[PDB]
């Protein structure tokens, strides 16, 4: 019956493709061709945070748009004061092979993980005056590539063993394990309502999970290579994923298929980070070509370049008020662009 | 600046601490140790005393940080750039055992390791000699035409391994170990100092 099951799977895939191609009456470009372009967007380096000595792999903005946490392979996670360039904390990590970091929405906690397969939670507001490790979550057999705080108590992690998990920081046991990816899950982004999230893996596909029931609601596959970043549209009904195919694509949850792709002939390097603007009009994508490009997400035309980094930019983030965008890079320098 | 002066002073203090840790940690030599399974990596890493296994030892006023990453059961491409700044690569080959050739070709021609020089170790010399005395060396190599002696077979294997590199900015230091010795630390130290001298001499506009 194995051949029958394979034939059934092929027929289901063909039905999915036919249904998706039935609803594509018109493309996004033919609809947004009637709107005015944003024009040239020049952003200047307002601040430069020179504290890290090794390559920076992650950054995250605080919910107050002022505090930022950055992680490097020097073994340090530093919380920054963006307005005054001051450093408020300097957390030494047990393992220096860290490839992700997170800032809790409340602001009392930070997370950090990497090649040690353990996600570590740090308490920032301890009564003893220092920062202490509240929890060390160890349930992954592969490197943790991303992590995001649902609230002060639960955190969702993405690992390189083709799984994403939902944790309970109080007890340290995986509440829900999400399975179905064929390759390493390299990115993750929780929705604004925080009821569902998307994960981009190395199997050139992005699956739409939901934390409550743990079932892959939808699967999007339009890329040609490994997906390195993903980010939810501010409306929460769409997301953009940038892959190593030197392209990024916009997928619609309700339409269930890709809408636009942001590619250029003179771009060969793959994306490392993707982030949106407060209004969802700009799509700032970080590239391995040492530069960050700003894409007019409705017209799929480039609107600017955030040049000024001396190495590949590994992380990009936009504050919650949309005032500024911060870019980390392997040259151990983070810059605030406004 | 009412009490923001105290915040600034705390920031300066922690920046001074950061520079102190950076200065202290800049004296370590980071070596990425690779090879196939049961190739002698564990044997030699403990000769000088589950995500990543790190071993540290000190030889002649140099701190050698040795990383074994063979325990990562995932594709190298997604995390191998974390080791782009290693001083060298220590490759272990079991002479008395094709997969190693493919692994060496993949790791020596990587985009992140174009300039990183490898240190090649050929362990199990005595076992290789015994196998040669028992079995011909053409079993593993169909295209090997020559004498069935130990020296020429070892030289042929070393040449086959060194044929896999193309860049002229890197060198392969091939050393043969019988595993009944404690000289591996000296070989690693000499290779490391030679690599450092070569890199510095490149950086001086003199190479």
């Amino acid at each position, epitope marked *: 019956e194995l051949d029958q099951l394979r034939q059934e799977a092929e027929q289901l895939k063909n039905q999915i493709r036919d249904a998706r191609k039935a609803c594509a009456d018109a493309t996004l470009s033919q609809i947004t061709n009637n709107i005015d372009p944003v024009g040239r967007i020049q952003m200047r380096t307002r601040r430069t945070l020179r504290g890290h000595l090794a390559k920076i792999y992650a950054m995250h903005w605080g919910t107050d748009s*002022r*505090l930022l946490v950055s992680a490097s392979q020097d073994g340090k996670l530093i919380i920054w*004061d963006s307005y*005054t360039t*001051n450093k*408020v*904390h300097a957390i030494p990590l047990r393992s220096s092979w860290v490839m992700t970091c997170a800032y809790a929405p409340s602001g009392n906690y930070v997370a950090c993980g990497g090649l040690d397969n353990i996600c570590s939670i740090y308490n920032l507001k301890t*009564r*003893e*005056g*220092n920062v202490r490790v509240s929890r060390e979550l160890a349930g992954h057999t592969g490197y943790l590539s991303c992590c995001r705080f649902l609230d002060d108590n639960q955190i969702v992690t993405s690992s390189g063993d083709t799984t994403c998990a939902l944790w309970d920081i109080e007890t340290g046991q995986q509440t829900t394990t999400f399975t179905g990816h064929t390759g390493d899950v390299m990115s993750l982004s929780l929705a604004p309502d925080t009821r569902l999230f998307v994960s981009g893996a190395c199997d050139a596909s992005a699956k739409l999970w939901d934390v409550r029931e743990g079932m892959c609601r939808q699967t999007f596959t339009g890329h040609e290579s490994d997906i390195n970043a993903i980010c939810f549209f501010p409306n929460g009904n769409a997301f953009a994923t940038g892959s190593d195919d030197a392209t990024c694509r916009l997928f619609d949850l309700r339409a269930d298929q890709e809408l636009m792709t942001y590619s250029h002939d003179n771009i060969i390097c793959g994306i490392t980070s993707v982030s949106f603007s407060k209004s969802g009009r700009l799509l700032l994508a970080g590239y391995d070509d040492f530069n960050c490009n700003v894409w007019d997400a409705l017209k799929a035309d480039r609107a600017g370049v955030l040049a000024g980094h001396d190495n590949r930019v590994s992380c990009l983030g936009v504050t919650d008020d949309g005032m500024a965008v911060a870019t980390g890079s392997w040259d151990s320098f983070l810059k605030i662009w406004n | 600046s*009412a*009490e*923001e*002066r*105290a*915040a600034l*002073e*705390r920031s300066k*203090a922690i920046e001074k601490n950061l520079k102190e840790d950076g200065i202290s940690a800049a004296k370590d030599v980071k070596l990425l140790l690779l090879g196939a399974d049961n190739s002698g990596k564990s044997t030699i890493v403990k000769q000088m005393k589950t995500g990543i296994v790190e071993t540290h030892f000190t030889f002649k006023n140099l701190h050698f940080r040795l990383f074994d990453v063979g325990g990562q059961r995932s594709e190298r491409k997604k995390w191998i750039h974390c080791f782009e700044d290693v001083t060298a690569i220590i490759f272990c080959v079991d002479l008395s055992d094709h997969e190693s050739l493919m692994l060496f070709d993949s790791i020596c021609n990587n985009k992140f390791f174009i300039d990183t020089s490898i240190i090649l170790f050929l362990n199990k010399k005595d076992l290789f000699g015994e196998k040669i005395k028992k079995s011909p060396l053409t079993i593993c190599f169909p295209e090997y035409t020559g004498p069935n002696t130990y020296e020429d077979a070892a030289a042929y294997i070393q040449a086959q391994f060194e044929s896999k590199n193309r860049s002229p900015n890197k060198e392969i230091y091939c050393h043969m170990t019988c595993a009944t010795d404690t000289n591996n630390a000296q070989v690693i130290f000499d290779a490391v100092t030679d690599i450092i001298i070569a890199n510095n001499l490149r950086g001086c506009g003199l190479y």
Partner: single-chain antibody, 231 residues
Framework: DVQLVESGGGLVQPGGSRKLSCSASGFAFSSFGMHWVRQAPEKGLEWVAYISSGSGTIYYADTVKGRFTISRKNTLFLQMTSLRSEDTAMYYC??????????????WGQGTTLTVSGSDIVMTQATSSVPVTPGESVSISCRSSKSLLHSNGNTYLYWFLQRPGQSPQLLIYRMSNLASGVPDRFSGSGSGTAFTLTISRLEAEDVGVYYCMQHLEYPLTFGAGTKLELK
């Protein structure tokens, strides 16, 4: 737990010298700035000296500069020299870690009773005693000679509570932020120079004396002290 215990108090002849020790345990003492706050037997609090983290910057009171010395084993010292008749008081040990969003003056020491045989911001509490009954809303007020609002939007007014027979405890820092462990019944508000603390649903444990303090510039000046009493 956090513990700040003082020792070195006793009868002192006038014109002599003494040293006060502050043994600290339960927190990272190295990263905390330490203050010395003294209170006369019948009067309010009066800031004395402050030593920052790493012994970087030290500030002294006008009536204290030259005579005293502050130094910080996990212990804080105060070298008192040439003690006058006005130096008799109870001296407190206060920890005041400073960074963005921190809560200075959060924990106060027990205190040691020592008995001896011009441009400063003046903060005045108009009412020195207020009769109040449990379950009602009591509003204490404070005023400042100079505006406490800074260019960054932070107003530096702190509200403390001294229960009878107990050391002061921080309630509101920067005039609007509630401290850690303080019940929600306390609120703070103010505008530049006039500040107000509102207590809702007053209980039996909320009785005591309330002091308003400024942290805009040293020396830090305390309020006169409004004493709330039951019935």
């Amino acid at each position: 737990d956090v513990q700040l215990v003082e020792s070195g108090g006793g009868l002192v002849q006038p014109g002599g010298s003494r040293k006060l020790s502050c043994s600290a345990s339960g927190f990272a003492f190295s990263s905390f700035g330490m203050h010395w706050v003294r209170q006369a037997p019948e009067k309010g609090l009066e800031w004395v000296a402050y030593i920052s983290s790493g012994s970087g910057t030290i500030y002294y009171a006008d009536t204290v500069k030259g005579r005293f010395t502050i130094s910080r084993k996990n212990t804080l010292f105060l070298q008192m020299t040439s003690l006058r008749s006005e130096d008799t008081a109870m001296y407190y040990c206060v920890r005041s870690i400073y960074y963005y969003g921190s809560s200075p003056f959060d924990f106060w020491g027990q205190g040691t009773t020592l008995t001896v045989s011009g441009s400063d911001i003046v903060m005045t509490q108009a009412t020195s005693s207020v009769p109040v009954t449990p379950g009602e809303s009591v509003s204490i007020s404070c005023r400042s000679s100079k505006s406490l609002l800074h260019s960054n939007g932070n107003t530096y007014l702190y509200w403390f509570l001294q229960r009878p027979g107990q050391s002061p405890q921080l309630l509101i820092y920067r005039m609007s932020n509630l401290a850690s462990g303080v019940p929600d019944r306390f609120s703070g508000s103010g505008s530049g120079t006039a500040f107000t603390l509102t207590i809702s649903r007053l209980e039996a444990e909320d009785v005591g004396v309330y002091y308003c303090m400024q942290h805009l510039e040293y020396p830090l000046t305390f309020g006169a002290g409004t004493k709330l009493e039951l019935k």
